[PDB]
Amino acid sequence: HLSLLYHLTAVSSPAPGTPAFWVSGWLGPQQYLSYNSLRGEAEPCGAWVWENQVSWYWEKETTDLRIKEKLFLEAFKALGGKGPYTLQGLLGCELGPDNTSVPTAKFALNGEEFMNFDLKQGTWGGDWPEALAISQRWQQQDKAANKELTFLLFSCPHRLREHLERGRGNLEWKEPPSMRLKARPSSPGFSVLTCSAFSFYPPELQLRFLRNGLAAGTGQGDFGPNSDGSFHASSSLTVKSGDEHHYCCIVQHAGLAQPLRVELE
Amino acid sequence: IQRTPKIQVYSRHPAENGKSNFLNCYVSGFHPSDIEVDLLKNGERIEKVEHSDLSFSKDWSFYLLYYTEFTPTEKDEYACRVNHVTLSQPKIVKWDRDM
Numbered sequence: 016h017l018s019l020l021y022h023l024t025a026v027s028s029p030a031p032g033t034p035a036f037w038v039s040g041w042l043g044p045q046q047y048l049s050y051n052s053l054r055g056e057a058e059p060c061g062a063w064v065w066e067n068q069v070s071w072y073w074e075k076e077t078t079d080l081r082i083k084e085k086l087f088l089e090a091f092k093a094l095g096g097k098g099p100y101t102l103q104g105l106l107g108c109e110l111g112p113d114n115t116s117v118p119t120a121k122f123a124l125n126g127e128e129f130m131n132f133d134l135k136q137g138t139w140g141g142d143w144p145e146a147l148a149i150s151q152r153w154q155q156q157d158k159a160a161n162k163e164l165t166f167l168l169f170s171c172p173h174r175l176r177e178h179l180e181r182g183r184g185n186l187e188w189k190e191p192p193s194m195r196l197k198a199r200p201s202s203p204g205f206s207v208l209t210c211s212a213f214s215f216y217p218p219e220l221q222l223r224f225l226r227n228g229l230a231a232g233t234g235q236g237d238f239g240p241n242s243d244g245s246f247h248a249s250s251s252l253t254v255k256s257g258d259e260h261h262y263c264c265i266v267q268h269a270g271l272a273q274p275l276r277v278e279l280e
Numbered sequence: 281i282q283r284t285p286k287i288q289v290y291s292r293h294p295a296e297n298g299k300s301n302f303l304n305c306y307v308s309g310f311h312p313s314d315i316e317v318d319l320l321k322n323g324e325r326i327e328k329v330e331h332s333d334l335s336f337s338k339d340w341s342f343y344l345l346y347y348t349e350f351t352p353t354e355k356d357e358y359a360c361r362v363n364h365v366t367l368s369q370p371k372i373v374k375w376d377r378d379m
């Protein structure tokens with residue numbers, strides 16, 4: 016954080032109507048980019064459509080991902096066999112504490128991390144024979160290692176700084192959650208208390224339960240996105256029936272000036 | 281490897297009877313990426329349902345958001361029906377309005 020990360024996926028037997036290869040691009044927790052092999056164009060997402068960009072910004076994104084499309088689809092040929100295969104890549108960068116770029120280049124096969132790009136040697140490496148086979152295929156493709164080096168060491172940090180400058184407001188966005196605390200009957204003698212946080216950003220948020228002002232744990236929680244890129248969270252706690260009104264929930268979130276106490280409805 | 285999906289169902293804003301809203305079915309943690317998701321209204325499949333891109337987490341498992349515009353009422357029940365290779369039958373998860 017704040018990272019610029021590309022999430023790349025290829026599948027060797029895509030379902031009809033779905034892409035063999037697709038990419039989502041992320042600025043921290045926000046999706047800024049979409050790309051798939053059926054359309055062949057990198058596109059901005061959401062608020063980033065209105066970002067003021069340098070000339071040829073999205074043309075350069077498209078060029079880079081078309082190259083990665085070919086490389087990913089070529090990787091299946093190096094494995095042979097029927098499969099099916101999923102190849103994933105996590106490529107990108109983040110600014111370190113001394114304001115320089117820190118690269119990320121990891122890959123997984125059928126959900127298992129198995130390969131990385133070594134930026135010192137400029138080579139793909141991994142212990143599995145599948146890693147060696149794909150590495151060798153990529154390593155002997157015309158200047159693919161050099162383009163990967165440039166993508167990670169130059170293009171990514173340049174793009175990240177551009178977005179940090181031109182989209183600073185989008186990334187500093189703070190929307191406080193709407194809160195609800197409700198109880199429902201459960202097993203005999205027991206109720207489930209649920210504290211829910213609606214439509215907030217950034218995603219970092221804490222929910223805590225109190226029983227008579229005293230800490231009663233965090234409960235069992237989960238979190239997810241909404242369709243606009245805001246977020247949702249909830250935490251639930253099993254309590255004794257008839258004891259529900261001794262409890263409250265506390266939320267901590269950057270959109271709020273102080274932790275907010277939430278009382279039972 | 282295969283990983284079975286976690287399934288969450290929640291609205292975008294707190295549910296208020298008669299006020300337009302969005303109902304979300306968030307599926308996450310699954311592998312491989314082929315997945316089928318339907319939103320149900322009192323058991324009937326909802327036609328006008330949209331979805332995010334298929335993305336994935338640091339642990340490489342995929343996630344995906346399905347959503348539909350809706351107006352909750354006192355008696356209408358909603359659910360999310362998910363099929364995936366890890367499942368012996370489609371899993372149905374009812375929307376808990378509290379969640």
Ligand SMILES: COC(=O)c1c(-c2cccnc2)nc2ncnn2c1-c1cc(F)cc(F)c1
Pocket residue numbers: 039044045046060061062240241242243244245331332333334335343344345
């Ligand atoms: C339908 O769009 C989304 O749901 C969405 C978008 C968005 C918003 C507007 C336009 N285009 C993309 N931006 C986001 N930023 C963080 N989450 N998020 C979700 C999201 C994105 C995914 F790739 C997977 C997922 F499960 C949820």
Ligand SMILES: *[C@@H]1O[C@H](CO)[C@@H](O)[C@H](O)[C@H]1NC(C)=O
Pocket residue numbers: 114
């Ligand atoms: C980080 O580096 C960029 C590019 O050189 C510069 O514009 C920015 O001011 C730096 N941030 C600091 C020094 O805090």
